[PDB]
Amino acid sequence: TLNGGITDMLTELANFEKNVSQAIHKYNAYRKAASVIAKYPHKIKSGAEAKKLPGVGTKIAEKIDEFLATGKLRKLEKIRQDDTSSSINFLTRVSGIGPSAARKFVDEGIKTLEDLRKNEDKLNHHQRIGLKYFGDFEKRIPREEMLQMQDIVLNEVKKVDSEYIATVCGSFRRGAESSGDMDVLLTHPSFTSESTKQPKLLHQVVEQLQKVHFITDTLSKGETKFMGVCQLPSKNDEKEYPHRRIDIRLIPKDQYYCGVLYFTGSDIFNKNMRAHALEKGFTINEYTIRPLGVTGVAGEPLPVDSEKDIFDYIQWKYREPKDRSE
DNA sequence: CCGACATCGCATCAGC
DNA sequence: GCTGATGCGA
DNA sequence: GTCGG
Ligand SMILES: Nc1nc2c(ncn2[C@H]2C[C@H](O)[C@@H](COP(=O)(O)NP(=O)(O)OP(=O)(O)O)O2)c(=O)[nH]1
Ligand SMILES: [Mg+2]
Ligand SMILES: [Mg+2]
Ligand code: NA
Ligand code: NA
């Protein structure tokens, strides 16, 4: 945490621009800046030194100079005192309440947790579950709990069909000592890029997990992506575990390596890698890496036999999951 | 200077 | 109902 | 907000 003060500031500015200003590119700018500073192996002494890093320009160098000199940012201090910004920033912390809805709720006089709790009928389903578990979703998950959760998910999936493979990705796969949620990549040989020979592949799994009272709530659910809530079982006389966010993503079996690269992240690592791909003349998603033709239209999927193959195409040296925490 | 900034699944709405 | 845009989270 | 062309 060499430059924690600076990266915290930039993250709060990023959050401001996303939630309040609804300026997603500023949000991404601040996030890129914070990320590149987070991995810089020196205690930054000035905005000039920081400006050397890619993603840090003039405006952010100035803010860093102000922050180093005073320990504060006046811009952020005023934002913190703004009632409307404070209200919007708070509401967006509920899952399902984004910048537009947050501002709309404020317009209608709904701006506190207590307000939300007495206006449950003005929330959509996602938002109501997000409110329900507002407290729990703030808490992080120790890796030890992540390991118990893994063991339940993998074993219940096996019981449905032994040909399923479930892989825990996200921050867990990057070796994090704690995670914000659980991310599960799912494959089955019946679902490939060429065909789907069995329906309800994801549904079966979701249902098995509900059956054993592991999955407790659903935020959204389609053919390939589940987003919901789960909970570890507790023992006699002990306080229950917090409820946790869990996502399950079914990916075509033959596109596992693009899928696991994507779901391992980080989110900023993925954006940076896909950015780099574009400069090298490719586009990468969770399914494929494709060349960009003379037009700027994606060509046919390239052969991929490992995560490293994807790195190879764009002339990046391979990075292990633990080194992708950007 | 200025266009372009990764990419996509699900829920919801607007228009037909 | 279909299509396409928007919001949201990932 | 930043930066390559
Ligand atoms: N390409 C791309 N991938 C993303 C993005 N957001 C998430 N992913 C991919 C890569 C992410 O790693 C993965 C899961 O997203 P989380 O659970 O939101 N983040 P994580 O598990 O890393 O951290 P933690 O849960 O401890 O907070 O989905 C995105 O904006 N873009
Ligand atoms: Mg996660
Ligand atoms: Mg997640
Ligand atoms: Na820079
Ligand atoms: Na939210």
Side-chain angles (χ1 to χ4, degrees), chain A residues 1-238 240-293 295-326:
Chain A
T1 53
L2 285 179
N3 296 290
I6 292 176
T7 57
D8 282 354
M9 163 184 65
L10 299 174
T11 297
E12 189 172 353
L13 287 167
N15 287 335
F16 171 77
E17 297 296 358
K18 191 197 184 197
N19 300 331
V20 181
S21 313
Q22 299 182 265
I24 199 64
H25 294 129
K26 291 199 175 177
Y27 163 72
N28 291 326
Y30 280 116
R31 288 237 295 160
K32 178 190 269 196
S35 180
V36 73
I37 287 168
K39 66 177 175 225
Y40 183 68
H42 309 277
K43 171 156 162 180
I44 288 167
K45 293 179 183 69
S46 58
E49 171 186 5
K51 197 192 175 298
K52 297 184 200 292
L53 306 181
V56 183
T58 310
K59 303 291 291 293
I60 289 186
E62 259 144 28
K63 290 186 172 58
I64 288 167
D65 280 327
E66 172 165 358
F67 179 80
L68 286 166
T70 73
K72 316 179 335 283
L73 192 70
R74 282 163 302 139
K75 183 180 165 77
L76 271 180
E77 289 291 89
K78 175 172 183 176
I79 284 168
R80 286 181 159 121
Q81 294 303 319
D82 196 53
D83 289 337
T84 286
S85 293
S86 293
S87 284
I88 286 173
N89 257 329
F90 168 67
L91 289 169
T92 64
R93 290 167 59 192
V94 179
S95 188
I97 304 185
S100 185
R103 190 171 282 275
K104 189 167 179 299
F105 283 130
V106 164
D107 285 347
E108 302 157 346
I110 301 162
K111 78 205 75 176
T112 69
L113 184 66
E114 161 196 313
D115 287 334
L116 289 173
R117 287 179 171 163
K118 62 206 185 88
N119 287 285
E120 274 198 64
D121 55 3
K122 293 182 161 36
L123 305 180
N124 64 29
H125 177 69
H126 184 152
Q127 292 163 346
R128 183 173 326 206
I129 301 308
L131 170 63
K132 188 183 180 188
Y133 300 112
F134 179 79
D136 284 356
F137 290 174
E138 293 291 79
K139 310 168 112 70
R140 305 189 48 85
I141 313 176
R143 186 171 186 90
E144 179 163 310
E145 289 181 36
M146 294 289 287
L147 293 167
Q148 299 176 51
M149 294 160 75
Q150 174 175 242
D151 172 81
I152 288 174
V153 169
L154 268 63
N155 274 287
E156 296 304 325
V157 147
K158 191 186 295 172
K159 296 181 197 178
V160 184
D161 191 329
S162 67
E163 298 221 78
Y164 281 115
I165 297 181
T167 310
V168 181
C169 300
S171 55
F172 177 84
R173 185 166 190 264
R174 303 200 306 276
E177 278 309 298
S178 74
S179 293
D181 57 29
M182 172 163 280
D183 305 285
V184 186
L185 190 70
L186 188 64
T187 70
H188 185 283
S190 271
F191 176 48
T192 68
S193 67
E194 255 298 306
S195 60
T196 312
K197 291 183 161 171
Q198 286 179 31
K200 298 174 169 175
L201 274 179
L202 176 55
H203 181 90
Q204 284 195 296
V205 162
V206 166
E207 180 166 346
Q208 178 67 22
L209 287 172
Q210 290 169 332
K211 205 188 98 74
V212 293
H213 309 101
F214 183 67
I215 285 183
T216 57
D217 305 88
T218 295
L219 297 168
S220 68
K221 179 176 180 303
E223 290 295 310
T224 61
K225 185 172 105 292
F226 174 83
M227 295 176 46
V229 183
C230 64
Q231 185 186 36
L232 286 169
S234 47
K235 299 204 259 239
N236 285 348
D237 285 351
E238 85 183 41
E240 303 195 344
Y241 286 94
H243 285 76
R244 314 295 198 180
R245 284 273 296 98
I246 180 162
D247 299 330
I248 303 172
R249 181 67 189 267
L250 179 68
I251 292 256
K253 174 81 159 181
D254 58 306
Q255 295 174 330
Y256 165 83
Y257 296 113
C258 282
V260 70
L261 168 72
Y262 148 75
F263 220 33
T264 301
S266 70
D267 53 344
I268 289 159
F269 170 80
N270 285 349
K271 185 174 179 290
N272 285 338
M273 186 172 177
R274 291 175 184 198
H276 183 72
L278 288 172
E279 293 174 8
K280 288 297 191 176
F282 311 83
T283 177
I284 300 170
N285 56 18
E286 63 259 53
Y287 308 114
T288 59
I289 176 170
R290 297 164 285 165
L292 294 174
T295 75
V297 151
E300 292 295 287
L302 299 172
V304 175
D305 284 301
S306 61
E307 289 179 75
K308 181 161 177 303
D309 281 350
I310 307 170
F311 283 83
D312 276 340
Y313 279 115
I314 66 178
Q315 303 181 281
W316 262 12
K317 260 167 182 168
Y318 183 61
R319 290 165 63 182
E320 297 294 340
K322 66 162 164 60
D323 296 322
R324 307 177 191 166
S325 281
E326 291 184 20

